Amino acid sequence: IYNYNGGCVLGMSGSNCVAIACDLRLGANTFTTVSTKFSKIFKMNNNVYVGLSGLATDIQTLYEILRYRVNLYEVRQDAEMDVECFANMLSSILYSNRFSPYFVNPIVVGFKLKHYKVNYEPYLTAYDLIGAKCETRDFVVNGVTSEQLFGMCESLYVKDQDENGLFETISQCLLSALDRDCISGWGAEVLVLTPEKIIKKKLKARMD
Amino acid sequence: DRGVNTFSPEGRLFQVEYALGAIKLGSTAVGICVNDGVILASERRISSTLIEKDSVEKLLSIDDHIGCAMSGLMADARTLIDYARVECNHYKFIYNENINIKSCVELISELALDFSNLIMSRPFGVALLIGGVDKNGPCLWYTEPSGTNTRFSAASIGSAQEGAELLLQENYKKDMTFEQAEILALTVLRQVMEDKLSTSNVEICAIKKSDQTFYKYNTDDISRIIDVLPS
Amino acid sequence: RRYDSRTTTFSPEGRLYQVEYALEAINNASITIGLITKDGVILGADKVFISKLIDKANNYEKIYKIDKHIFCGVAGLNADANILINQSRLYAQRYLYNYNEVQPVSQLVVQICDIKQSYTQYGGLRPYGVSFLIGGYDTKDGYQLYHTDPSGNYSGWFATAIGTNNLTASSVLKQEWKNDMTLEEGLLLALKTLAKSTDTEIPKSEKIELAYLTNKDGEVYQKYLTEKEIEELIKLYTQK
Amino acid sequence: RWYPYIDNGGTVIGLTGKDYVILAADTRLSLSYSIYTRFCPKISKLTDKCIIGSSGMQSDIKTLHSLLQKKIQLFVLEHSHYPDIHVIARLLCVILYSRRFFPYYAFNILAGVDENNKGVLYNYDSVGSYCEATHSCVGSGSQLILPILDNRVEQKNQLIKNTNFNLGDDINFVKDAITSATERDIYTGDKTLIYVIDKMGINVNTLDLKQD
Amino acid sequence: TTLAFKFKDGIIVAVDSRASMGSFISSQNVEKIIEINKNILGTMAGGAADCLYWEKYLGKIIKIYELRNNEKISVRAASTILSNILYQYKGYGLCCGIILSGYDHTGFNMFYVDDSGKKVEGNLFSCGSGSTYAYSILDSAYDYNLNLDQAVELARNAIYHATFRDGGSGGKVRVFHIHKNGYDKIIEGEDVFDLHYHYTNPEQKDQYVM
Amino acid sequence: NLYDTDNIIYSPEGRLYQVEYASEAIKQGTCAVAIKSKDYVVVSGLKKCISKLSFPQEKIFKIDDYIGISMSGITSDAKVLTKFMQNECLSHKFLYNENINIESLVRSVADKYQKNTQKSSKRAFGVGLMIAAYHNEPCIFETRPNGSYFEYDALSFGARSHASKTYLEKNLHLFEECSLEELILHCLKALKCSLSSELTISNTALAVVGKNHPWQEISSLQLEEYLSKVKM
Amino acid sequence: MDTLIGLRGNNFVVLAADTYSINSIIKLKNDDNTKFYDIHGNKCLLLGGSIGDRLQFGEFIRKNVHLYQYQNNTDMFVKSFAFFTRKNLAYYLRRNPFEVNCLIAGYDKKDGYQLYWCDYLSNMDSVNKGAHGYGAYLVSAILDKYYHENLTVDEALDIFKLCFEELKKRFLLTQINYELRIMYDNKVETQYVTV
Amino acid sequence: YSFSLTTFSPTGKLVQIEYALNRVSSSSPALGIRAKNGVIIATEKKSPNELIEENSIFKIQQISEHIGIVYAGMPGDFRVLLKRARKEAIRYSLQYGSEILVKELVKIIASIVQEFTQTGGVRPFGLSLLICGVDVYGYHLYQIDPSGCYFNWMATCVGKDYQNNMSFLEKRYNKDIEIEDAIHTAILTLKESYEGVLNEKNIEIGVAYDNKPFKILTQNEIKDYLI
Amino acid sequence: SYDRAITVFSPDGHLLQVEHALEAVKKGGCAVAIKSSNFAVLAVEKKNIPKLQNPKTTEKLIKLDEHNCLAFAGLNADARVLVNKTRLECQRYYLNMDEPAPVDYIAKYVAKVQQKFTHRGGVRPFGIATLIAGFKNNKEICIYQTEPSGIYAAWKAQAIGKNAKIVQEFLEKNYQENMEQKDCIFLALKAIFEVVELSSKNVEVALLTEKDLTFIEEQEINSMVELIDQERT
Numbered sequence A: 001i002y003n004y005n006g007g008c009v010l011g012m013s014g015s016n017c018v019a020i021a022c023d024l025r026l027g028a029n030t031f032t033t034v035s036t037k038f039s040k041i042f043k044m045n046n047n048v049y050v051g052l053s054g055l056a057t058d059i060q061t062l063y064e065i066l067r068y069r070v071n072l073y074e075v076r077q078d079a080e081m082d083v084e085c086f087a088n089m090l091s092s093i094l095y096s097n098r099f100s101p102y103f104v105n106p107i108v109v110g111f112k113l114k115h116y117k118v119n120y121e122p123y124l125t126a127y128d129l130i131g132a133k134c135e136t137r138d139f140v141v142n143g144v145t146s147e148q149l150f151g152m153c154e155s156l157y158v159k160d161q162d163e164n165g166l167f168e169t170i171s172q173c174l175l176s177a178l179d180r181d182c183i184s185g186w187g188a189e190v191l192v193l194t195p196e197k198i199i200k201k202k203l204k205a206r207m208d
Numbered sequence B: 001d002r003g004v005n006t007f008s009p010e011g012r013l014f015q016v017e018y019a020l021g022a023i024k025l026g027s028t029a030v031g032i033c034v035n036d037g038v039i040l041a042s043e044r045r046i047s048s049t050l051i052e053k054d055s056v057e058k059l060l061s062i063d064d065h066i067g068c069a070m071s072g073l074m075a076d077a078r079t080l081i082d083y084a085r086v087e088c089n090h091y092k093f094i095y096n097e098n099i100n101i102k103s104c105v106e107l108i109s110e111l112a113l114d115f116s117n118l119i120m121s122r123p124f125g126v127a128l129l130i131g132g133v134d135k136n137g138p139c140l141w142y143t144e145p146s147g148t149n150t151r152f153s154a155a156s157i158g159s160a161q162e163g164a165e166l167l168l169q170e171n172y173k174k175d176m177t178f179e180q181a182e183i184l185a186l187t188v189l190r191q192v193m194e195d196k197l198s199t200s201n202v203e204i205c206a207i208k209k210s211d212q213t214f215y216k217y218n219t220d221d222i223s224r225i226i227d228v229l230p231s
Numbered sequence C: 001r002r003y004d005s006r007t008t009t010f011s012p013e014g015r016l017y018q019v020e021y022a023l024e025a026i027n028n029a030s031i032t033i034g035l036i037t038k039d040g041v042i043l044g045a046d047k048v049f050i051s052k053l054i055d056k057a058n059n060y061e062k063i064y065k066i067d068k069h070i071f072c073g074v075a076g077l078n079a080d081a082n083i084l085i086n087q088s089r090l091y092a093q094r095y096l097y098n099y100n101e102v103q104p105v106s107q108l109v110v111q112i113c114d115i116k117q118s119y120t121q122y123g124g125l126r127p128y129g130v131s132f133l134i135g136g137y138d139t140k141d142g143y144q145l146y147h148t149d150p151s152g153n154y155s156g157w158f159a160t161a162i163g164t165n166n167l168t169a170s171s172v173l174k175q176e177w178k179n180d181m182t183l184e185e186g187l188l189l190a191l192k193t194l195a196k197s198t199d200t201e202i203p204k205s206e207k208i209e210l211a212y213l214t215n216k217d218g219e220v221y222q223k224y225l226t227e228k229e230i231e232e233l234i235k236l237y238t239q240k
Numbered sequence D: 001r002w003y004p005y006i007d008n009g010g011t012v013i014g015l016t017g018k019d020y021v022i023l024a025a026d027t028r029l030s031l032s033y034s035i036y037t038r039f040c041p042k043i044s045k046l047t048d049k050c051i052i053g054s055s056g057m058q059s060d061i062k063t064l065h066s067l068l069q070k071k072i073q074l075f076v077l078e079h080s081h082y083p084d085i086h087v088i089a090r091l092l093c094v095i096l097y098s099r100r101f102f103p104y105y106a107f108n109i110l111a112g113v114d115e116n117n118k119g120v121l122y123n124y125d126s127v128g129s130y131c132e133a134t135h136s137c138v139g140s141g142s143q144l145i146l147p148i149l150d151n152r153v154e155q156k157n158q159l160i161k162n163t164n165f166n167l168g169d170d171i172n173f174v175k176d177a178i179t180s181a182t183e184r185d186i187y188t189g190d191k192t193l194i195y196v197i198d199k200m201g202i203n204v205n206t207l208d209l210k211q212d
Numbered sequence E: 001t002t003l004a005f006k007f008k009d010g011i012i013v014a015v016d017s018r019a020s021m022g023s024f025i026s027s028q029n030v031e032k033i034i035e036i037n038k039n040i041l042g043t044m045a046g047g048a049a050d051c052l053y054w055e056k057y058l059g060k061i062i063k064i065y066e067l068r069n070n071e072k073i074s075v076r077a078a079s080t081i082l083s084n085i086l087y088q089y090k091g092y093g094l095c096c097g098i099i100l101s102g103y104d105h106t107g108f109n110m111f112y113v114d115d116s117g118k119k120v121e122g123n124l125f126s127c128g129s130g131s132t133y134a135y136s137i138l139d140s141a142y143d144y145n146l147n148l149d150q151a152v153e154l155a156r157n158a159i160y161h162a163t164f165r166d167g168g169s170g171g172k173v174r175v176f177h178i179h180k181n182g183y184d185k186i187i188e189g190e191d192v193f194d195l196h197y198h199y200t201n202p203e204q205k206d207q208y209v210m
Numbered sequence F: 001n002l003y004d005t006d007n008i009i010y011s012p013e014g015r016l017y018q019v020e021y022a023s024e025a026i027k028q029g030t031c032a033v034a035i036k037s038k039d040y041v042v043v044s045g046l047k048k049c050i051s052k053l054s055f056p057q058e059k060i061f062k063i064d065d066y067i068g069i070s071m072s073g074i075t076s077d078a079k080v081l082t083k084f085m086q087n088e089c090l091s092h093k094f095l096y097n098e099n100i101n102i103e104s105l106v107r108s109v110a111d112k113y114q115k116n117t118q119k120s121s122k123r124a125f126g127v128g129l130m131i132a133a134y135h136n137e138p139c140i141f142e143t144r145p146n147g148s149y150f151e152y153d154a155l156s157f158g159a160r161s162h163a164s165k166t167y168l169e170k171n172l173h174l175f176e177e178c179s180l181e182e183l184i185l186h187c188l189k190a191l192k193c194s195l196s197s198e199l200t201i202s203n204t205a206l207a208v209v210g211k212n213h214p215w216q217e218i219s220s221l222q223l224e225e226y227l228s229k230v231k232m
Numbered sequence G: 001m002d003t004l005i006g007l008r009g010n011n012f013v014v015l016a017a018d019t020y021s022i023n024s025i026i027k028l029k030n031d032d033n034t035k036f037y038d039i040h041g042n043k044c045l046l047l048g049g050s051i052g053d054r055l056q057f058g059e060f061i062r063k064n065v066h067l068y069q070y071q072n073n074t075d076m077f078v079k080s081f082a083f084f085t086r087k088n089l090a091y092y093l094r095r096n097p098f099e100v101n102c103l104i105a106g107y108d109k110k111d112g113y114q115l116y117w118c119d120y121l122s123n124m125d126s127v128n129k130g131a132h133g134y135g136a137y138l139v140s141a142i143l144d145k146y147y148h149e150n151l152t153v154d155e156a157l158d159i160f161k162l163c164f165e166e167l168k169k170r171f172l173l174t175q176i177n178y179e180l181r182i183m184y185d186n187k188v189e190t191q192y193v194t195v
Numbered sequence H: 001y002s003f004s005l006t007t008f009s010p011t012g013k014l015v016q017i018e019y020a021l022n023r024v025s026s027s028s029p030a031l032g033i034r035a036k037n038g039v040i041i042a043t044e045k046k047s048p049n050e051l052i053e054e055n056s057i058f059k060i061q062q063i064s065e066h067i068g069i070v071y072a073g074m075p076g077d078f079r080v081l082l083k084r085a086r087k088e089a090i091r092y093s094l095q096y097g098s099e100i101l102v103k104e105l106v107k108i109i110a111s112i113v114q115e116f117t118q119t120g121g122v123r124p125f126g127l128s129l130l131i132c133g134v135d136v137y138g139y140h141l142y143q144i145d146p147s148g149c150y151f152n153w154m155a156t157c158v159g160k161d162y163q164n165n166m167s168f169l170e171k172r173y174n175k176d177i178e179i180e181d182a183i184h185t186a187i188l189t190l191k192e193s194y195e196g197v198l199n200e201k202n203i204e205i206g207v208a209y210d211n212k213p214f215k216i217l218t219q220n221e222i223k224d225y226l227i
Numbered sequence I: 001s002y003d004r005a006i007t008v009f010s011p012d013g014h015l016l017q018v019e020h021a022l023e024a025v026k027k028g029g030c031a032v033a034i035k036s037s038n039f040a041v042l043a044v045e046k047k048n049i050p051k052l053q054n055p056k057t058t059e060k061l062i063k064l065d066e067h068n069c070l071a072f073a074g075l076n077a078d079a080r081v082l083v084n085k086t087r088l089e090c091q092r093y094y095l096n097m098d099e100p101a102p103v104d105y106i107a108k109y110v111a112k113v114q115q116k117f118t119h120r121g122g123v124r125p126f127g128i129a130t131l132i133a134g135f136k137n138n139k140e141i142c143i144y145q146t147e148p149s150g151i152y153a154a155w156k157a158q159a160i161g162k163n164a165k166i167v168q169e170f171l172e173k174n175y176q177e178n179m180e181q182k183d184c185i186f187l188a189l190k191a192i193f194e195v196v197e198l199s200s201k202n203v204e205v206a207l208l209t210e211k212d213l214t215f216i217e218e219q220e221i222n223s224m225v226e227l228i229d230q231e232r233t
């Protein structure tokens, strides 16, 4: 069922710098694509991002459900929402349809604020199609192309890293993973968030 | 002060009696039943001249073989008429034959007392003069908010119903011809109006024994009846 | 039956007697102001003074935001306000869920006035004793401002004032308001009509609260004025 | 994993005339290859001038006949006249189609005499379709007897022709047909009830068939 | 095998009379055309009980609508009602196949309705096992502005040839004619036997070979 | 005074006024009378006629073979009770293929009286029923707006019932062990006593039921013959 | 089975689809009208699948969008129309599935001329061009080859003519008759083509 | 049968809610102080007969690890409100996996109180909660009313002679007050309010010391503070 | 209360809540409707505070469907609710019949709904009088009226709201059959201003055809009010 609209997402961490990336394919009947702009990354808060991989309708439906819940939370509390709270709420939503579930394997990527000045701690985690959370503290990968990404990251991860080197690392890992999957690819985007700014870049991938 | 279904000390329900008060005002109507068929009529209480007078109709048809004549709160009356024709077509679906008029008035009376929990909220405040033809023969029936229904050879409802019943008592006779019944109905109706009788000022319907079909008289038939009307 | 309050039941004159008492409750409340400006829409108000130990920082009890592009000012009972604020936020995010675009303010105020009309008509529950000055921006109609009431009536207003001494405030708005005007001029006029309504020559910075909504840089945002900013505004008002 | 359908087996024969209708049926109940009892009438009288016969599941036909008699009695109570056979036919059509998705295992025949002294005969399927006829048969033996009735009544593929038919010859033809079915089918029966309807009421006789 | 087409003097509707429980025919005479309204007819195909019950139900609802509103219903509205109610029983086992044809205020109109809510407007339709044969013969020899006699002859021959290569279809032909003021039954029922031995084997010598 | 606003309030004396008012509605209703002997229960009643053009209203009703009733009070309530009893007897004969026990049916309708008297926002029926049947014995039962039922040798309902009751207790001993004809005659004398202003074929109803005698209203000719016998 | 084609560029939009009413092995008609659903305003909905499913879904979506526009007295945005159709299709997919493809198109003041692909499992995304059915295989690569920025409506119609010629020549159902629906310059023009 | 017993009078004023405030004003007082590095809720309990034990009755409770509460009014109302507030904190923690914010809990309980004012066949709650807690956004102190409206305080008092206690607490209070001085001001405020003599088992105190669990002081610690 | 009868028969046999709804209607602003040949004119008054109120937000005169239109007088919130109900029923009819809803069906449905709320527990009557304008199924213009009691009838011309009797008396002695569009607009503007202060800003008039509803511009209304002001003086 995940061969229908195959996709992949990825996210790494570094020294006061975090990265998230995805492929831009939308499939139909497995072996014929229809679009090269379907971004699996969705901005949700000023320092929280979420990567949804799986069936496209379930990706979109889960995006609107989470956007509803999020914007409700910032409007009532009148303050910015935390990554852990969003992760727990996402796990509850995926569990709430434990039977007949959303066929989506999401991830969460963002920053953790520790007020005292303020320190931005990286945060990354991944989920099954039910909400099997597992904190990882380094590279997090999820999708049909997950095995190739797991293979690439350990060879290419260098612990904490500069944001430029992080972009090179995550870009090479994603491009080498997507080239070895037939139903995943067709371009890529790499979002590198920092406290000062976010850099969004698209890669000259084997989109063909 | 009190609920809808509160008995009086005399055993009468207050809401039912007040509903009987409401039917005392309204458009006068007259019904006659004879061997060859049934006749109904109404005074056609026209409003100001800007009204079309086609939409304002007092003689509707429950089915192909049933007519009616309303009195009292008219929106409630149309609700009762709608339920009646729905149930008659339900009979026509469940059973091939045409529904008897007695069963139709019984269902109408059953709906009228629906406010008593034994959903609606108060009595309908409507009096109907239903008429039709079936295998048993032509007949007409009377309905009122109290639920009792009584079957007639000739009757009337509305404002000038008492004088209409008196003239019908004086003039109606058994073994009557249908033309005699039509001229009798127009004589009684003309005597109980306020305005002079005319073509647009009156409406008539009838269900013949042979046709067994509802048929509202048009302007030509009404003028023909008026021209041969004694005075 | 014997203990019934006769809520959803017409008067002899056709008024229901309950929305009327709700409106007298509105007229005794603290005043709220509304203004539409070329740069934005403003919902200044007046705090009721309960005690000096109330937290001055934040504690915006009159103006609330329904979304990033919608925000309103309360002119009645606070609990009846806040439950309807929650319903409004629910309706906004529900429309964004259904259609994937922001809800126009006209749709939203139609929904709040519809649900308020329901308890006025259906059942035997009392109406909500609250009247809002809902304002916001949309691409269909731009900056708008409305006036809701417990009856479920709503009407558009370029500038209006509700609550106690609303006659004097509306007179000042009729005298001073202009079609095209700056945000600073609108804020100064808001201080002027608040001072006139409060029977004070100079407004007190602790006794008032201001907010504005501008579609600046193609991204609408709300600002809520702090004590220092209100002090600077009152200094400009005294200078002017 | 329980199938709520068994063919108890049987046959009901029907034939009409100018002013009469003849309906005949077995009096055997059975299971697949064994017989319960030698006397189980499937014909149920509905009105003074109408009867109904059936074949299939015994419980379904009993429930259907008693339900139809309930509806007829309620109709007479509410409306103060007996229902006609066409009325009963449409009522049975609506009753059968109410259970469309769990249908009655009952192939029905509805016989009687109209108000104009005409012997009618309606024949049914399990679901509710119905059509008037001058001859019909249902049950296990339906394929056996139905060509014979077509030869006798319609009498196509013939040139000399003979339409002179009366009540006794029609009855004797029905006795011959049910005897042939009893010889040529195992579920048919051992005693049969020849219901005859006329303007002067209803009469019922009984006949003894083979016991095998 | 049902049939319906539109021409200068209204609409002609033709049907067979067979009825099959499988390999065995239940009854050779039936009526597959119901007067749903005085000005509207409807053919019948597929499951007999389903189509019969649902056209009678539609006739009931049409009597409700006409008697309330005091206006004759159109064929489009009846077809839409039928397709809506049949779609509610989707995936349940119904096999209703219907061709609704009649005159209304718009004009002469014709619709096809199926168990799957398949409302299709047209001027020529045919449903059943022998639908293809009737379609073939009409589209070989159907034209607008031909006489009523030619139309009934064409419909009768099409129903005959549909019965000729279809065991499911047979019995008798019932050709009806719809016009402005209701309808008339041109052929109440006519045996296909003499029809065959008039059309294809006019000389009664030797078996016909094909 | 103020304890008659609702049906759920006991007075200081301890009386439901609404139920008493329903009984008052029964007492103002038209007449009826029933008599039984050893193997026959005869029922009769005066059919209301409000005008010379009006025809007589239905008074006697049929519920089931060998069971029938008569009416006095609100007619719509009688319609509801008749439909309930007809459905109950027909359902019993459906599911069990036997005639229903009559007193179980009487308890059922009395329960329907009770549940409407008891809960608020509902009214008791303004009608009493005169149930007559032959369940292997002639029997006459009674119902009241309160949940209650009693069994009688003879009974009367509403109108000038005092004259009828005086005649019945004056002649109760002779009702047992007399033929059906004299039984019908005595019932007509009781109704004529309730008249106090003449009995005719149109304005009276009559029904008979007994052993080997299902419930059947008497024809016009036989009723005219009995009326002429009463006149003579 | 039912071929739908769609193309979008600067200042035009084109939709296309075969005109065939298939039942079993035959055609009820060669001039079908059950596939296109005109919406009030510069909007349209093209459906493909079983006839009853597209009839119910298209009428339901069209008449609800009309209800929105009449109640609110404003023209619904194209993006709102597309995502509302997707949400309705997904909801009905989870309970009472509608096997029906989609091609939402329209014009908006804020977004301009735009098109949306959508599958029978509500697999929706904006595209400049797309197709549905088995004929999507034999026309989509043509659309890649001859599409370029700053296109015109006549060039688009030439591309559609090439696709129709290919579907007649090579596709198993040699589809001859087609119906088009062009949106440009605040007009909605319909054409009928027979290659 | 469900109809609003609470209704608008002429001039409104919500007379049942006014009677609920009259219930609160006659009930035993409670108070709370917000300090620089802590928050206090304190209340006096009536001078008990010897049969009562203070280890059973508790006007001070805890909803979560960091959140406390005190009331002044009907005890059963406080019990059901406390139980449902615990359920609200629990469902929020089940969803978002964290200790509940003070503001969200205050909003929900205010909405529930409004629902009971609005709902038919009921009467308002006859108490006035006083919730205190600590979270990411500093310390908070809130005050629920029978109306279902919440107010953010830095120091407040409830119950009998609440105006005089408010004035006294206004006289002796600073924004940068230490936690021990806040406790001393609470003791002096309730001592002025009681018009009698105090000791252990006559007063009860709850406090949250910095980012640590909410703590209820035993009688030994209060006796140490009284000296 | 919830599910109990609040409207009931008085001792005189009148449902007093319905007459109270009629006084609520009579306090509401006036409205007029005319028809002739193949079109209709709808007029409603207007009241706004100058320099503060936005005239665009007013929705006294509306469109229900492709052809049907509606005007009302009474409580505006109840009017909005019943308007949304009728629009829902219009699109429900158009999905179950595949023909646009005729004016007679919508007038009957509005009367049915108002009688339903008048004849059920837990709901008071809709305190509004509406009059619907639209084309019949046979392409015949007919305007319907509707009272809170559920009474409805078809009129050639009729008015509602404040001083409706005086306006209806005026229309009886000035209505003509098959008038021009300018003549109908002139007659409606005279009729509404018999009982309304003379100014262009106090009315919102529109004209209905088979194409669509078209609101008359401010300049034509200003010319018309000036012309009748000259005519009166």
Ligand SMILES: *C(=O)[C@H]1N[C@@](C)(CO)[C@](O)([C@H](Cc2ccc(F)cc2F)NC(=O)[C@H](Cc2ccc(F)cc2)NC(=O)[C@@H](CC(=O)N(CC)CC)NC(=O)CCCCC)O[C@H]1C
Residues within 6 Å of the ligand: D123, D124, D125, D126, D127, D129, D130, D131, E001, E002, E016, E017, E018, E019, E020, E021, E022, E026, E027, E030, E031, E032, E044, E045, E046, E047, E048, E049, E051, E095, E127, E128, E129, E130, E131, E168, E169, E170
């Ligand atoms: C034209 O092509 C022509 N073919 C046939 C004759 C083929 O059967 C038919 O489809 C016919 C319809 C018909 C028959 C009689 C009638 F009064 C009206 C009518 F519309 N079809 C059938 O009779 C059913 C065959 C069938 C087709 C499709 C299905 F999905 C299921 C069945 N047969 C019956 O209806 C049968 C019993 C039945 O309901 N079945 C089969 C067990 C389905 C549950 N009933 C009868 O034959 C008549 C009652 C019994 C008389 C003793 O019409 C046109 C198209």
